[PDB]
Amino acid sequence: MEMEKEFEQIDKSGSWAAIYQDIRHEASDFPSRVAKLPKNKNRNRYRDVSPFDHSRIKLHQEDNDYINASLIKMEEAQRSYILTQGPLPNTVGHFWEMVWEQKSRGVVMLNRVMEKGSLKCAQYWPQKEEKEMIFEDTNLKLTLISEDIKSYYTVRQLELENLTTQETREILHFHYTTWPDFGVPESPASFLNFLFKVRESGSLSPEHGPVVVHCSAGIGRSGTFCLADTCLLLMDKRKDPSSVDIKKVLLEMRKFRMGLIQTADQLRFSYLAVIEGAKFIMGD
Ligand SMILES: c1csc(-c2ncc[nH]2)c1
């Protein structure tokens, strides 16, 4: 079925939970043996969220190459994404090592450091220009260059230096600051505006490594971001845009990381975002 009328048909029939459970039942199951080794227990935030072995990102290190991060490679859309958990106190150096080694331009952060009165990820970037961060375990230096605070999101320019080689690179940090502590946003308009700002920066383009996107676990909000981006790109590429099937795209993405889209409310929000976004693209 088309999307917008399938949407109304699920609303009127109140069957979002059943649609979402079908997706959960059909989703791929692949091994995640490296994630479960005892030496990696303090590298995982949640015991039930792990990268599959076949798609995990490997650190270029001979001691321990593990990070909780996955490469989502979308063949028809010609887009790739790295989805990862919010960094832990003992993985901030690994996080920036990955950014460096994978040649990423942008980092997309969809959570606040504290939500619901608990810490959801480490403070992994510097908050003042004159107070830079040094990660001694991976030999990197990170400096805040500029910060632009808007009503729904903040953009930061960061400099990452590999202290071994003295090479430097500019990284863009796109921080969506207004996702509510409970539920999903009432309108997708600010989330779509944010997605378009990431696109306009070059951070999603083929001349760079894959964008790094995270929330707390790296499957829920993060899944919503890449699902909406990929669906909109396919609708631009194909002769028949109504042939884009959001459930099939989601199942394709779940071949690369488990658990993408965590609730039926997040599924409904993803439909809403793609529907509204397809009108603004045109050509409107
Ligand atoms: C959650 C999982 S591991 C962890 C941690 N590591 C160090 C401090 N807190 C928090």
The angle that helices 16-26 and 246-253 make with each other, rounded to 10 degrees, is 40
Annotated ligand binding at 106? The verdict is no
Q: Catalytic residue among 121, 215, 226, 231, which?
A: 215
Is the dihedral angle over the CA atoms 64, 87, 264, 175 positive or is it negative?
negative
Resolution (A): 1.8
The count of domains in the chain is 1
| Cα separation, 95 vs 59, whole angstroms | 9
Residue 9: CB within 6 Å of ligand 1? Answer: no
Cα radius of gyration (the chain): 19
| Cα separation, 42 vs 115, whole angstroms | 21
Q: Which two tokens stand for residue 120?
A: 């959801």
- Taking residue 35's Cβ as centre, other Cβ atoms within 10 Å add up to 20
Chain breaks in the chain (C to N over 2.5 A) after: none
| Cα separation, 1 vs 7, whole angstroms | 10
Structural domain harbouring 58: 1-284
Residue 215: phi, psi to the nearest 5?
-130, -135
Q: Which two tokens stand for residue 166?
A: 């003295």
Assess contact for 223 and 83: CB atoms under 8 A: yes
Question: Which residues, in sequence order, are CB contacts of 55 under 8 Å at separation 6+?
Answer: 70, 71, 72, 73, 255, 256, 257
The separation between CA 192 and the C-alpha centre of its own chain, rounded to angstroms, equals 14
Assess contact for 56 and 70: CB atoms under 8 A: yes
Is 269 strand, coil or helix?
helix
Question: Which residues, in sequence order, are CB contacts of 106 under 8 Å at separation 6+?
Answer: 171, 172, 173, 174, 198, 201, 202, 203, 204, 208, 211, 212
The CATH number that applies at residue 11 is: 3.90.190.10
Nearest CA to ligand 1 atom 7: 89
Residue 41: CB within 6 Å of ligand 1? Answer: no
Q: Which two tokens stand for residue 162?
A: 């590999």
Q: How far is CA 105 from CA 16, 84, 196, in A?
A: 36, 15, 16
Assess contact for 249 and 230: CB atoms under 8 A: yes
Asked if 226 is an active-site residue, the reply is: no
Beta-bridge partners for 158: 144, 171
Nearest Cα to Cα of residue 178 among 197, 150, 203: 150
Between the CA of 88 and the centroid of ligand 1 the distance, in Å, is 6
Between the CA of 41 and the centroid of ligand 1 the distance, in Å, is 9
Experimental method: X-ray
